[PDB]
Amino acid sequence: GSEKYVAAMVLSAAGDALGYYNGKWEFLQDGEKIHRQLAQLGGLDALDVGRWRVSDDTVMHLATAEALVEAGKAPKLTQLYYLLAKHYQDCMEDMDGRAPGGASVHNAMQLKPGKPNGWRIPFNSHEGGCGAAMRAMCIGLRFPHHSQLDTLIQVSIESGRMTHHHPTGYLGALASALFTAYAVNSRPPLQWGKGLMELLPEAKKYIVQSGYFVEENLQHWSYFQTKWENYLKLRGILDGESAPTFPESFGVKERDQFYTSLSYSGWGGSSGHDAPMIAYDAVLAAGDSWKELAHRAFFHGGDSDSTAAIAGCWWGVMYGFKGVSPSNYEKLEYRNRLEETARALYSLGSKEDTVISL
Numbered sequence: 001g002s003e004k005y006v007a008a009m010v011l012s013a014a015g016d017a018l019g020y021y022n023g024k025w026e027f028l029q030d031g032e033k034i035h036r037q038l039a040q041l042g043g044l045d046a047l048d049v050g051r052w053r054v055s056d057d058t059v060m061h062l063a064t065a066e067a068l069v070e071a072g073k074a075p076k077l078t079q080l081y082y083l084l085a086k087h088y089q090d091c092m093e094d095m096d097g098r099a100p101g102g103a104s105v106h107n108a109m110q111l112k113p114g115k116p117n118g119w120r121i122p123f124n125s126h127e128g129g130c131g132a133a134m135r136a137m138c139i140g141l142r143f144p145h146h147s148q149l150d151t152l153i154q155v156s157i158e159s160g161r162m163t164h165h166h167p168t169g170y171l172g173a174l175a176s177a178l179f180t181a182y183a184v185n186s187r188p189p190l191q192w193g194k195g196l197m198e199l200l201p202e203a204k205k206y207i208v209q210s211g212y213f214v215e216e217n218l219q220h221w222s223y224f225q226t227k228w229e230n231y232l233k234l235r236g237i238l239d240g241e242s243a244p245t246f247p248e249s250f251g252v253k254e255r256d257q258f259y260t261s262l263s264y265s266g267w268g269g270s271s272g273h274d275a276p277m278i279a280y281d282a283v284l285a286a287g288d289s290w291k292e293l294a295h296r297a298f299f300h301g302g303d304s305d306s307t308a309a310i311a312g313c314w315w316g317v318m319y320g321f322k323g324v325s326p327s328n329y330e331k332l333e334y335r336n337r338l339e340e341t342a343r344a345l346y347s348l349g350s351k352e353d354t355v356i357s358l
């Protein structure tokens with residue numbers, strides 16, 4: 001349904017804005033303090049996002065979505081990648097006060113849309129941030145059909161690699177896009193992690209045949225895979241055939257500690273592996289509760305705008321606006337653009353088509 005695509009785009013942006021709070025909550029490392037301030041504001045249902053700007057996450061996600069819309073039906077990947085690179089480069093003019101990420105901004109300005117392979121960048125050991133994952137969800141809105149899985153894999157990886165040429169970075173884009181497609185198709189969330197694990201060898205097959213920095217990509221592959229395997233084992237969902245099990249003590253402070261344990265270097269949710277992982281952990285626990293989703297994915301001491309942007313997209317696809325206080329989105333920055341782009345993505349994604357690959 002079109003309304004679920006609208007909710008996916010709008011609630012991803014609402015999550016971003018809520019987990020950002022004009023920077024005040026993004027950069028507060030104490031989840032308990034964030035939750036105290038939330039209560040002082042009146043709780044989530046009382047928050048009005050009219051003055052809560054979206055961050056770079058939404059600006060980039062909209063850039064991905066607009067490129068997908070402009071590429072049209074039965075698109076050529078050469079054209080799509082030109083449009084993606086152009087939109088990523090141009091959207092850096094809309095980052096004032098949005099705390100843009102390092103790899104995202106630097107590499108977007110390096111791109112040369114219009115040269116052949118001009119959106120390709122070298123492998124880099126420090127390009128494992130979540131900036132590719134945070135902007136990839138709508139790739140799954142565009143390519144949700146089983147027949148399009150190879151396109152979803154290729155486009156999510158290449159969109160990611162335009163700024164994050166490191167498997168920890170671009171495999172997060174794959175996870176973000178893939179789980180959105182699963183949500184579109186009503187696949188139960190407890191099956192999603194297993195689906196990602198089964199598709200990682202197909203992602204590797206693409207990277208190898210693509211031929212760029214194969215040795216470096218392979219040398220760094222194990223980190224993302226191992227972190228996800230261990231997380232899925234901890235939750236009891238490695239094979240996709242069990243309800244998840246959560247720890248007995250899993251309040252705000254315990255979640256901050258857990259998110260730090262998942263992190264690469266201490267900031268939970270800031271990398272390609274852990275931004276979608278924390279969003280997924282929130283989805284698994286929250287079911288149809290927007291408030292629980294927010295408490296787990298929007299309001300924590302880590303990189304909360306990025307886990308929120310991912311979680312809000314997946315949740316909106318599944319549940320629409322049901323149980324969401326209107327003040328959480330009615331006056332949201334870019335609401336009209338988000339809704340119009342979502343409707344255009346729906347017209348494309350709901351109509352199964354075939355892409356002309358590279």
Ligand SMILES: Nc1ncnc2c1ncn2[C@@H]1O[C@H](COP(=O)(O)OP(=O)(O)OC[C@H]2O[C@H](O)[C@H](O)[C@@H]2O)[C@@H](O)[C@H]1O
Nearest residue numbers: 099101102103104125126127128129130131168264270271
């Ligand atoms: N090999 C690596 N493996 C895992 N994580 C890494 C690696 N290298 C860096 N990191 C982490 O990658 C983290 C971020 O890398 P940055 O390049 O600044 O940013 P972005 O472009 O990805 O976007 C970050 C977004 O998240 C917020 O919402 C922000 O506002 C952005 O919107 C660093 O802390 C690194 O520790």
Ligand SMILES: [Mg+2]
Nearest residue numbers: 055056057305
């Ligand atoms: Mg951000």
